[PDB]
Tab-separated table of C-alpha atoms in Angstrom:
chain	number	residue	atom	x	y	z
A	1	UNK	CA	91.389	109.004	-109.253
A	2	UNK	CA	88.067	108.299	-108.841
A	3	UNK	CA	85.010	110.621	-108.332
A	4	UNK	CA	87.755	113.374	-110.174
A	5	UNK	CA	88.316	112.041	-113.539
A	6	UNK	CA	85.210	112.275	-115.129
A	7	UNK	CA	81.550	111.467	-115.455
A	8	UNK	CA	81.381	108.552	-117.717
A	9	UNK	CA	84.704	106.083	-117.754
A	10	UNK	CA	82.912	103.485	-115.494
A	11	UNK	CA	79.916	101.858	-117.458
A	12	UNK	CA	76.721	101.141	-115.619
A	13	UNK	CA	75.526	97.490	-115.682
A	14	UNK	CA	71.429	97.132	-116.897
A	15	UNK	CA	69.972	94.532	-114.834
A	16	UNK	CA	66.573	92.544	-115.255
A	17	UNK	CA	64.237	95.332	-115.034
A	18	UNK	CA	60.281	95.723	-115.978
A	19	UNK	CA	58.255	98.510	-113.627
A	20	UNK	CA	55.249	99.465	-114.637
A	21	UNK	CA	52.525	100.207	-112.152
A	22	UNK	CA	49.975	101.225	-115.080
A	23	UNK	CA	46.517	100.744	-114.016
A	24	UNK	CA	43.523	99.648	-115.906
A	25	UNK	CA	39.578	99.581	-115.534
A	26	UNK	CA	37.525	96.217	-114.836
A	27	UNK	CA	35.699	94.801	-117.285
A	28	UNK	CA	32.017	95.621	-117.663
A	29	UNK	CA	31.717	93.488	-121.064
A	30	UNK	CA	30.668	89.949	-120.621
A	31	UNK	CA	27.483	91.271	-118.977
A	32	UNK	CA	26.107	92.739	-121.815
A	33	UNK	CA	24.152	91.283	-124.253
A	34	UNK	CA	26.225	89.939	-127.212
A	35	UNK	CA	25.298	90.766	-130.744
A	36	UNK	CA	27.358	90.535	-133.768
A	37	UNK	CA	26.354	92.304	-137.021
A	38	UNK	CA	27.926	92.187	-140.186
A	39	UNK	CA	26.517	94.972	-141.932
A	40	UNK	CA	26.736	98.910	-140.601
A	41	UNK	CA	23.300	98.952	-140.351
A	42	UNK	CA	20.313	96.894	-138.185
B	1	UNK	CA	29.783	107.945	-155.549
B	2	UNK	CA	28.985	107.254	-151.486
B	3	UNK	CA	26.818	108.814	-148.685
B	4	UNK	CA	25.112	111.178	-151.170
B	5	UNK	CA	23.051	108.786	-153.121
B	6	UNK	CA	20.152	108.029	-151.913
B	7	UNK	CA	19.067	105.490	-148.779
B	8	UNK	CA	18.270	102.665	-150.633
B	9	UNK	CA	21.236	101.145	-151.322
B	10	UNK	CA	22.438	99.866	-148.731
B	11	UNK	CA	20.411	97.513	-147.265
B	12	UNK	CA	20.443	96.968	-143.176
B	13	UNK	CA	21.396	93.553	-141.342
B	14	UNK	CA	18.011	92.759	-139.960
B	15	UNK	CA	18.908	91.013	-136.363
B	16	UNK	CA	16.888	88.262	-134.702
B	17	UNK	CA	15.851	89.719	-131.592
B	18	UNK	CA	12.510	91.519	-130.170
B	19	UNK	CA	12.934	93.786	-126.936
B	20	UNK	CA	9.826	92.699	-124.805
B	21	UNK	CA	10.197	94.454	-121.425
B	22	UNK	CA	6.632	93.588	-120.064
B	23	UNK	CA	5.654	92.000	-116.861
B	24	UNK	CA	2.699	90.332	-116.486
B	25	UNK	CA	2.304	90.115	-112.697
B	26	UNK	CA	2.215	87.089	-110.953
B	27	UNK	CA	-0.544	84.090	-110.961
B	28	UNK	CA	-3.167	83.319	-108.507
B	29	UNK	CA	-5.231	80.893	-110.198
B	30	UNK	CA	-3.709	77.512	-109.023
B	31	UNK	CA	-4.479	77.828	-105.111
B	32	UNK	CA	-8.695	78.587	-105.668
B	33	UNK	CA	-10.415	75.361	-105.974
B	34	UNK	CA	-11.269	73.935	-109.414
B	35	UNK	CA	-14.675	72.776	-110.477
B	36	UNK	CA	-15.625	71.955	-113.882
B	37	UNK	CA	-19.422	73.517	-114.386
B	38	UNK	CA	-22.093	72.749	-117.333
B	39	UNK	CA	-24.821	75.081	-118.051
B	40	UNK	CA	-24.736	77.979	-116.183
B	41	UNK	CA	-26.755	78.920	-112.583
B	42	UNK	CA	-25.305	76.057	-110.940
C-alpha cells in the first residue's frame, strides 16, 4: 500500500532543469586604456 | 639562480606611451584684428 511500504520503491523522474540565479558585476574594462606588455617589467 | 642576482638582468619592456596631463587653456587670438606691422612705433 502506498505511503506505508517504504520510502524509496517509486523512482523520481529528473526533468529539464538549470536554476541558477548567480549574479555577476558589470564590466568596467573596455574603458580603460589598453596596453599589452610582454615582459614583467615597463 | 633567480630574484637574488642582481637588477640587471632582466631588462624591462619599454612601452610607447608619454602621460601628458596638461591643459593649456583656451585661445583668444583669432577674434582681435590682425595687422601685419614693419618697424616698430607705428
Amino acid at each position: 500500500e502506498a505511503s506505508t511500504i517504504g520510502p524509496a520503491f517509486f523512482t523520481p523522474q529528473v526533468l529539464a532543469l538549470e536554476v541558477d540565479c548567480n549574479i555577476e558585476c558589470a564590466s568596467l574594462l573596455d574603458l580603460y586604456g589598453q596596453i599589452e606588455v610582454s615582459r614583467s617589467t615597463f
